[PDB]
Nucleic acid binder design. Sequence first.
RNA 1: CGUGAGGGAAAGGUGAAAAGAACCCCGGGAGGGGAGUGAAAUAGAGCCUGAAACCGUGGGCUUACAAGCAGUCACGGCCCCGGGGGUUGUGGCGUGCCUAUUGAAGCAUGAGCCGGCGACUCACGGUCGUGGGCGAGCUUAAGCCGUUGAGGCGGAGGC
RNA 2: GUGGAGCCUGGGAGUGAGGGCGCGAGCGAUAACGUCCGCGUCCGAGCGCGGGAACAACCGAGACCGCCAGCUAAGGCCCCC
RNA 3: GCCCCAGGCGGUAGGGGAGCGUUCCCGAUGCCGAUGAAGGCCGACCCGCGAGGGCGGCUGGAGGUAAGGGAAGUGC
Lengths: 101, 50, 202, 112, 116
Amino acid sequence: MFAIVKTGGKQYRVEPGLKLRVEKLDAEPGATVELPVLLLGGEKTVVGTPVVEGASVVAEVLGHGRGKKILVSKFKAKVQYRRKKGHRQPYTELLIKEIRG
Amino acid sequence: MKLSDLRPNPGANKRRKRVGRGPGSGHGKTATRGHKGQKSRSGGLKDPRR
Amino acid sequence: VYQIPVLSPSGRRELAADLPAEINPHLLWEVVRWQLAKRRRGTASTKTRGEVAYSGRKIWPQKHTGRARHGDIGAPIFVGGGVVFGPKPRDYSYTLPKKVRKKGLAMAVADRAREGKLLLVEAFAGVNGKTKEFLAWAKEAGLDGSESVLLVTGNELVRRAARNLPWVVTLAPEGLNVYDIVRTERLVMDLDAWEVFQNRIG
Amino acid sequence: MEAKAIARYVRISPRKVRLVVDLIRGKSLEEARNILRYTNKRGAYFVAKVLESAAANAVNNHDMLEDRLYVKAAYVDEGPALKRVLPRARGRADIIKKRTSHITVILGEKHG
Amino acid sequence: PRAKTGVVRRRKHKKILKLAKGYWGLRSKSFRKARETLFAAGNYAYAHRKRRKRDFRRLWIVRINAACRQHGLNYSTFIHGLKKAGIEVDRKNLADLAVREPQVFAELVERAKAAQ
RNA sequence: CGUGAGGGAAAGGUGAAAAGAACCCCGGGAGGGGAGUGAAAUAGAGCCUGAAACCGUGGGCUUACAAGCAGUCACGGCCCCGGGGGUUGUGGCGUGCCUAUUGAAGCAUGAGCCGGCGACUCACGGUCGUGGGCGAGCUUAAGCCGUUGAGGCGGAGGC
RNA sequence: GUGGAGCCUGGGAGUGAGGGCGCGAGCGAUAACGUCCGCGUCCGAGCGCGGGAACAACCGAGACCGCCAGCUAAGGCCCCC
RNA sequence: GCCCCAGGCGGUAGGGGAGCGUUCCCGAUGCCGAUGAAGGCCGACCCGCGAGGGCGGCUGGAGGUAAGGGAAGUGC
């Protein structure tokens, strides 16, 4: 049983016992969260419209990380314009606990 | 109070405006002198007051 | 205001005593910058393109040589040429305002004093011109050596008998200055140097 | 075991002798000997002396079986070029780099 | 006091060069060419960050359009259906369903033509 | 170097100690390998460290229907380290940098590359702001006295 | 009408080679990627982005950053795409 | 009231602000250093938005130098 849910303006197909990085949620490590389920994919393949009515997944947050340093570096030519900029997008590493109907 | 605790007031001392140190400082390649011209040349203009 | 300890064979007297009750750390900062500044040799010299030992003859003609244009080898763009804007014989001294020097001096004394690290002395009966004299005195006088102390007095038998001490800084009363007062954890003065101190902040 | 001899500071063009030395890489010792003896190249001589010298070192010093000896790896580092002047036309002068070469031979006992 | 270049210039060059490992020719050997190629690689990194999203969206529309055409309707019709069908699943998950869940994606097409 | 007046270089570093490598072997020698000294010998005299350019030598990936300012994103493959690192086969995108320009990828200028030097300062005046001192007051210069890194006096003078 | 609006007082500027497009004119030949003006815009400085195949000023739209999310603009929806 | 609220964040000339690093003075008759400084090479490790900083491995063999300030022959 999988299901598409939403978080950070995104849609993730998920299944229980899955480690899934997401946007930096607001929840203490070890905390759990129920999620908006876009659609239950499986036997009773119910289509969330726009969301499944009573269904929602449960996932205990594994912890907030910081993505690898994307080195955003703009450059214009013939103008003396250089912009080096470190960057690390935070994330909330999760575990799919289950999928509530 | 020992010597390491001696600090001027915040802003009492101040950096200089070092020029010609690249684009990052924003004061680079021209030292604020702009492009070509009598004023941009070394030595500069005549007496601007008069 | 600042009750000062006074060691002596008669025990520990004190003084009241008048000092600037408030410390303005920026002021002592400026004064120390003054003393350090004015004692700079300023012997940093260089050679401009006119000072350098080369000639003024153009190395090769302006045009048609293929080489880039150059004048004399002594110019600042040649290895060996003079320096542009290199340091010159320069005096870093300057007159810091007298009320500021005097005031700040009093404020340093107020710092070490009000922080307990001041100790006037009536006499130096122990010391007589030998170092160990001053050692057994100072340990006798409540000093171990961990406190780099600024010793100020007019007794050359005392100062001379205590110069070699690493943790002691020698001064006659005239040489009292904010820099040395900040250099030391604890301060020590003779009562005469106390007086010349007062007259110096009169 | 690997033996090695080095003609350090051989006054000869490095690039030239590299063509020779690259001809005996991976060869048996006897093979390389014969190939050197009949290769029309000036560097072939120096490669020869370094070769046999490496054989002596492998035999006497490191005590290897001369039969199993082959050129395990050899090469030619470049040495300190001697700069000289070639007087060219119209007053101007060139600077020829009389190049010196370092030769390295490395011997092993090929098995099987 | 004199302050010669000392070690700063060399360290900066080594920084740029370690950025330039894996570039063809002098572009990974000369600090100058390395710097320049790193400029172009920077602007490329940026614009291709902004590009990759559009690209994967193009792939998603492609695969989805194929799977939908295997059920009679085209991409625009399917999109119009799901939009009318009150479903918000995006091009990525639609594509992954169409490749993985032909029956589930088949149901999506079911509600899609159901939208008409 | 210049007839000459005159111009004018480069070029320091073994090791604590020469203890500077006896002797053997290969070699005409050089040089090399052993041995030996040595804390260390890629400290061996062309000697502290020893960077880059440059040069080669081995290994991993990869390449002979193939299009390219050399990259970048994705995917895949391979190899390595244990989720990462190296290579790129494919697909997408993509007009070097600097100056000077209305306008440069420009077939406008400069640069062969690397390493090092290389350019907005100082003085004294003025003006603005500011951190502090004093405040209808502020303030000393020369010099003098002191230490010999200690400051104080000095009111002449200036505002 | 609260805006990187306005005014005043001071310090520091650079700029004082502009250009294209539209419109209204002059000159020109009702020629010029021409010149010279006015109003406006864009570039300049936005050769950052989509379209126009390619293209500074034509159309869309003002690039703080990231995301393997969604909606549209001009422009497209036979393949490249 | 360190956090939340709203808004803003293309950018040359240019104006302003904020930091990083180099040599040297104070801190320092101090502290680190043969159990290895500086320096060199390397890192996919950590900090920072960046200038850079740590930390680690090997080379190197003897100097380095804090917090906090100052002064420049300071960044190619």
